[PDB]
Amino acid sequence: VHLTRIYTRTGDDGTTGLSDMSRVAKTDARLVAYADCDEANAAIGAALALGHPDTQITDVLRQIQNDLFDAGADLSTPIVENPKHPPLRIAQSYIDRLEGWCDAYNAGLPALKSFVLPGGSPLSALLHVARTVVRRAERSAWAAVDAHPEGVSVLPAKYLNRLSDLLFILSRVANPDGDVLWRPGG
Amino acid sequence: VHLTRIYTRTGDDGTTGLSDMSRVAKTDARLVAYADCDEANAAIGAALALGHPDTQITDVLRQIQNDLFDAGADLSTPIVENPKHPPLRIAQSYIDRLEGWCDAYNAGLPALKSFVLPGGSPLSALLHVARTVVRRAERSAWAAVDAHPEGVSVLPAKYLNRLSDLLFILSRVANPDGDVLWRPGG
Amino acid sequence: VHLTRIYTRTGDDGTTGLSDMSRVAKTDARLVAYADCDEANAAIGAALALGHPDTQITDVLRQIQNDLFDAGADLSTPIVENPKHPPLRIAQSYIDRLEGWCDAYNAGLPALKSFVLPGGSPLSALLHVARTVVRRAERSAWAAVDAHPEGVSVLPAKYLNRLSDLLFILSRVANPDGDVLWRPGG
């Protein structure tokens, strides 16, 4: 894929193209899903640029930013029988990796008896922002499945499901002293 | 409530649970409402972590972050007749408090004859971001009322209504010199 | 227009006013469109306040923040035949200006053979966040056209279309060394 002039004016009527170049409305549920992946990817970039994460988190998050483009390519390309070219799809491989990162980073942390108030470190607060945006993207991914239960894979949404759980764990690690707990009705 | 393993895989089919553990689609309007409260809460955490607010704003905003979890507990728990346990609900008490903070912080500021361009301080700009996210959450809260006018309270949405007004006032105070005014068609 | 008490309680029933003071639901597609313009405007303010953009970008972005209020005034005011007062509307003039900024700032940059991972500079990462929020606003603007193809202009949405292309170019310029490229399935 190529990024040259950037502005082509081909979407000035409110329509645009999926990856097979078929035309959709810019409100199409599939587009909203991989659009929200774009927005989640930018939230992680904000966390990387203002958060000063250590080397090992920067490598995990950079892989996730790359996975999010894999996920968008998946969502933007309709599923067809025997495609001429084999499409890039999300695989259980991706989710297993996320679960391993969850278990590893969640090992050294204790249980919580209530919700944490987002904030603390610049890195911890921005991971929380990214966490909520990924969760919004997950909802859009599931809505895309509802709209096209054959043409859209469930694996992008399952990836986004596990990812927001990992981002939560990482947000706690970025507050190595501890985060403030919600006190109901306090 | 307990946060332990974090990832349970019970939502890998696009369904999830309200606080009474009844099952809903992850696109359910009630969930979208308290999801957007989560996103607004994270925006305030970004304002607290990168904004360096003074002591008195940090205490006001920390209370709001706690109120937002009260509001989410409200929205996530259907209203029923004579519940076995009494549920945590938002009350006029919450909104009266917000109005007092509005009046107090708006006392020392002058009138405006047009809109302000968001920006200035890191604290002022991030309060504006939080302001717009809270307003998005308010719209979702009202949509939840439309979907379930008996099972959902109007008070969460009324809290979110007044809250975005307070966040605007606080955004001006964080620009103690003044913000740039919109000039129509300038 | 005047900003005085801020909180009027007139929207505590989930209704609110367009610029002609006619009443709409707070979920009205037109309101969602200029609400999303507000959210995009705040994202640019975050980019201006934490990004330390040079003088020439700050002047371009400040003009865009002003255009976004022009665009919201357009979207919030229904189109009518022979209005008593002439309404502020977006014009091709606005979009031509954006295209000139695109061409000028895109001149000194090379082609790309794949997507860039958002991040890098605080300014570059926050421009990416703003880029994705503007794109979300564009989708809402097109949905407003669908709901009211006579009462809503297409020009706000076309402005938002070109604007996200410009924000992308500016995000690259704020990484004068280069951004990381997506590697499919890497």
Ligand SMILES: C[C@H]1O[C@@H](n2cnc3c(N)ncnc32)[C@H](O)[C@@H]1O
């Ligand atoms: C932790 C709680 O958050 C809600 N929940 C589950 N999935 C999402 C999502 N993608 N976005 C927002 N809220 C969600 C459910 O109610 C769950 O039980």
Ligand SMILES: C[C@H]1O[C@@H](n2cnc3c(N)ncnc32)[C@H](O)[C@@H]1O
């Ligand atoms: C200030 C103006 O903003 C619009 N307005 C009112 N409530 C909201 C909301 N929750 N989110 C976005 N825009 C809103 C109405 O048009 C109001 O008059």
Ligand SMILES: C[C@H]1O[C@@H](n2cnc3c(N)ncnc32)[C@H](O)[C@@H]1O
């Ligand atoms: C670059 C690709 O992004 C998708 N696209 C086009 N317009 C938007 C928008 N406003 N918001 C999100 N995604 C969009 C289309 O698929 C286009 O081809």
Ligand SMILES: [Mg+2]
């Ligand atoms: Mg383009």
Ligand SMILES: [Mg+2]
């Ligand atoms: Mg989940």
Ligand SMILES: [Mg+2]
């Ligand atoms: Mg989970």
Ligand SMILES: [Mg+2]
């Ligand atoms: Mg209001």
Ligand SMILES: [Mg+2]
């Ligand atoms: Mg108000």
Ligand SMILES: [Mg+2]
């Ligand atoms: Mg476009």
